[PDB]
Structure formats: structure tokens, C-alpha cells
């Protein structure tokens, strides 16, 4: 089983005017592509070190594995969290849970925006599901640290706040990026991930 | 392979009165044993995750691997750094390097003691060799984080400043433990590690 770069499910310009084609092309075809390849390189190095019982080599490889492995996990989710058919508000059981756990959909938006804007440096904001508590939970992660691998929460919706995700279009003004991205959220996909947690 | 607890190179009471037999027996047969057992469990989980390509599981296993893997690496070195015939000062090229890089043996002791006393929480102090710079270097490490795996420095002499290493005998007074341990340093072993660094 070798990881592979997934195709983007839509045209590079499908998210205009909210996210321009230049960002989408660079973010997918350059940034994500590097993560998959570097993840595969690290896994092959780790397999060799593991078979030899070289614990020092295993530990030295952990930063590259989390960085590149998280990069592959996060971006693969991110593309599915967006869609030209997205935007608006969710419906059904997910909307009920958002209202129950955050008060309202608008309050949820404020909390996830605050967590995403609040990331100092590189990282991600996540809406997740806490399996043990059986409810939604917002968390932020640094760099490419993935939500489930580092927190156990199941990712539902991720907002990439790496500068490369918005800088070409919005420059330093990250809040302008957060406003635009709500128009392309694929709530159908987020619902599928949420419903997969409930049985 | 499967990691195994190495035999101690001497009796548990060989370091009296500086480190008592109760500490040595607990530290080796309980603390270190747990690291080996848990390290083997974590390595087996990682092998399974690698074959399935489960990157999330790999990343979730990193804390146990570094903690237990570092514990096995670190403690195995610590036992060899001590000897009932130890103490005093080194000789030959190692003493020359200590004088060159730290000024004198006494100044080296002050610096490594300060770094070891300066550890806030659990961790380790290390004298290492920087291969790229070709000289000695003092560093501190948190928890069981190993020197080479996390810094690239080759370990020469390690001082375990975890509370379990000295609390039974010295209680909260870590400086008394740090002073006593110099009497049992196996400079012969540290010298072997140093010469292994040089061609
Ligand atoms: Mn990105
Ligand atoms: Mn210890």
C-alpha cells in the first residue's frame, strides 16, 4: 500500500471568486504533491529502521513523518471539505448538533474562525467529533499536525491557515480569507464524515 | 528483533553510598523494564500500521515510541556510564578535549551540573560530541527524549535527573545527587564512546 496524490474533485477555477485558480493549483499540485512524495520517502526509511530495530533512526524520522504524513492527511480532507456546490448552512442532524454544542450555526462560525485566526504561525483549525463525549469539538493544530493522530478527534471540517493558502489573494489579511471560504464549504461531505461517526 | 532488558554490568549495590541499591534495583528492573516492554508493543503496532498505510495510527504512536524508545536508549547508556571503579578525572585525549572546549575539567563539571540542575521537570543532561563542528557540547533533554535522535549529538555521558533516580536517597535535593554521581563516573566507557567518534 503506497499513498498517492488524489486528483482535485473540481476545476482549479471552481472556487472563484472565493479562492482563485493560482492558489488552488499551487496548493494542490505543488504543496500537496511534495507531502505525498516526502511521506513515502520517510515511510521507506522508517521501514528499514524498524526492521533493524534502530530506535534512534525511528525517532529522528518522527518530525518528517508527522509533517509530511499530516500534510497528506490534512490536504486530502481539505479538498473534499470544499465544493462549487458548497456554501450556505448544513441541514439535518449535523445542524442540530451544531446548535446543541455551540448554541447556533453563527456562533459555531465565530468559534471556528476565532480558533483559525488564533493560530500563531502555521497550522490548522478543525471542527471535530469527540467519540468519547459524543459531541462536536473545535480544536487548532500547529504546522501539519493532524487532528485525529494528535488529539483523537475525528476531522469533519478543516480550514487551512497556512499563508500559502490565501496570501496570493488576501495577503496578510487572513480574516478576508476566512470570510470567503464559508461560501464553498461542502456541507454534504462534512455531513458524511459526521454521520460516519454515528451509527 | 524485539528489545530485551540488558543485564546491569555490576551489582545493584556497586555504586553505594552514592546511589543506593534500592534505587538501582527499581530503576533497572522496574522503570527500564517497562520501557523495553512498552517499546516492543509500540514497535509492533507501528509495523502493523505501516503495512496498512495507516498514517494516522503511525502519528498517534509517535509519543509512545519516543518515550519508551528513548527510555530504552537512555537508560542502557546510563548504566555503562557508571562503575564501582569510577570517579576521579579522565585522562588522555578526552581530558584534552574537555579542557579545550570547557576550559578545565572543573568548569565542565560546573556547566553539566548547571544544565542538569536546570532541567525543569523530567529529563536528562548529556555531554555529547558534535560531529559536524568536531567538538564537545552540553545539552539537556526533556522526559526520555534521546540526545542523538532529537539533536544529532552523539551521547558520551548522561546524567538521569528524573526524580526516580535520586528521590529515595536524596529527596528533593537534586544538587546532592549531582555532586555524588561524579564519584562513580566510568570515564573508561565515556572514553570509548569519545574515541568511537574520532576516526
Ligand atoms: Mn496547505
Ligand atoms: Mn530513569
Curated annotation (Swiss-Prot), chains A, B:
PTM per Swiss-Prot/TrEMBL: Nitrated under oxidative stress. Nitration coupled with oxidation inhibits the catalytic activity.
The protein, known as: Superoxide dismutase [Mn], mitochondrial
Induction: Expression is regulated by KRIT1.
Residues modified as N6-acetyllysine: 45, 52, 91, 99, 107, 179
Domain of life: Eukaryota
Enzyme class (EC, first level): oxidoreductase
Function summary: Destroys superoxide anion radicals which are normally produced within the cells and which are toxic to biological systems.
Cofactor details (free text): Binds 1 Mn(2+) ion per subunit.
Leader peptide range in chain numbering: none
Compartments, record wording: Mitochondrion matrix
Record-listed 3'-nitrotyrosine modification sites: 35
Cofactor section: Mn(2+)
GO CC terms of this entry: extracellular exosome; mitochondrial matrix; mitochondrial nucleoid; mitochondrion
Reaction catalysed by this enzyme: 2 superoxide + 2 H(+) = H2O2 + O2
Assembly notes: Homotetramer.
Amino acid at each position: 500500500m503506497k499513498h498517492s496524490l488524489p486528483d482535485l474533485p473540481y476545476d482549479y477555477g471552481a472556487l472563484e471568486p472565493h479562492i482563485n485558480a493560482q492558489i488552488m493549483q499551487l496548493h494542490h499540485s505543488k504543496h500537496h504533491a511534495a507531502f505525498v512524495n516526502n511521506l513515502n520517502v520517510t515511510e521507506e526509511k522508517y521501514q528499514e529502521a524498524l526492521a533493524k530495530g534502530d530506535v534512534t533512526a525511528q525517532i529522528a524520522l518522527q518530525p518528517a513523518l508527522k509533517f509530511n504524513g499530516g500534510g497528506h492527511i490534512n490536504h486530502s480532507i481539505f479538498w473534499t471539505n470544499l465544493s462549487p456546490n458548497g456554501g450556505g448552512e448544513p441541514k439535518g442532524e449535523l445542524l442540530e448538533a451544531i446548535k446543541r454544542d455551540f448554541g447556533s450555526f453563527d456562533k459555531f462560525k465565530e468559534k471556528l474562525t476565532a480558533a483559525s485566526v488564533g493560530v500563531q504561525g502555521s497550522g490548522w483549525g478543525w471542527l471535530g467529533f469527540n467519540k468519547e463525549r459524543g459531541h462536536l469539538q473545535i480544536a487548532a493544530c500547529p504546522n501539519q499536525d493532524p487532528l485525529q493522530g494528535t488529539t483523537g478527534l475525528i476531522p469533519l471540517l478543516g480550514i487551512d491557515v497556512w499563508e500559502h493558502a490565501y496570501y496570493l489573494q488576501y495577503k496578510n489579511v487572513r480574516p478576508d480569507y476566512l470570510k470567503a471560504i464559508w461560501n464553498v464549504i461542502n456541507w454534504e461531505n462534512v455531513t458524511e464524515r459526521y454521520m460516519a461517526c454515528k451509527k
